[PDB]
Design a protein around this ligand. Structure first.
Ligand code: NEC
Length: 210
């Protein structure tokens, strides 16, 4: 039921640099994931202009931030375009249209990790704070899939049943033990205000029930 894949070599190298470089300004991961969500929302907004039935899977365009202290997870949910199975494997597993090469060269020429979004690889900044990342996604043209990786050079993809989402993507960050500050309401609010205050879709920060 589960397929296991190797990252393209350059992607594994990039992930290793992100995981092993001493770099304290880890909060920038959230900006990068929210920007990726905003881009995905732009895409379905545009496609629905000439094909309104693409919103049959949900008209609302928004971003949800869901902390769970019991599971030690932070989840970033959007109702954007979503990804097909091929999209997951290509976009997360290979260089594809990213600036992976430019970023790694830039780091050797005076750039720092906070500039990762300039190079189209902001998603991998999740590994600044997460030991494992799970991506659940549903595109209008495919079934629901789950991508997962704890780095180390490989990732898995499986069909995801139970809790079907209408359309969009959930990025589930299983946080490192010493990065639980990013589950705290005050900290998340601070980061969103600092780095994501002009995003063109509603960002809702969920409250914990306990
Ligand atoms: C890992 C670096 N590559 C990407 O992030 C690409 O993966 C896709 N992607 C990333 N996040 C999302 C998302 N929330 N929704 C849809 N596609 C995404 C986009 O095509 C990105 O350009």
């Amino acid at each position: 039921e589960v397929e296991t894949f190797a990252f393209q070599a350059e992607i594994a190298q990039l992930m290793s640099l992100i995981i092993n470089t001493f770099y304290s300004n880890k909060e920038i991961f959230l900006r990068e994931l929210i920007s990726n969500s905003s881009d995905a929302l732009d895409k379905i907004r545009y496609e629905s202009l000439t094909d309104p039935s693409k919103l049959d899977s949900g008209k609302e365009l928004h971003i949800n931030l869901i902390p769970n202290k019991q599971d030690r997870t932070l989840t970033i949910v959007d109702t954007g375009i979503g990804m097909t199975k091929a999209d997951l494997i290509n976009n997360l597993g290979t260089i594809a249209k990213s600036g992976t090469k430019a970023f790694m060269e830039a780091l050797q020429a005076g750039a720092d990790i906070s500039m990762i979004g300039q190079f189209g690889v902001g998603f991998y900044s999740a590994y600044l704070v997460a030991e494992k990342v799970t991506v659940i996604t549903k595109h209008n043209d495919d079934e629901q899939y789950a991508w997962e990786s704890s780095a180390g050079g490989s990732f898995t993809v499986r069909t995801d049943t139970g809790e079907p989402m209408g359309r969009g993507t959930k990025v589930i960050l299983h946080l490192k033990e010493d990065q639980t500050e990013y589950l705290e309401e005050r900290r998340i609010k601070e980061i969103v205000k600092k780095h994501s205050q002009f995003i063109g879709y509603p960002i809702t920060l969920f409250v914990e029930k306990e």
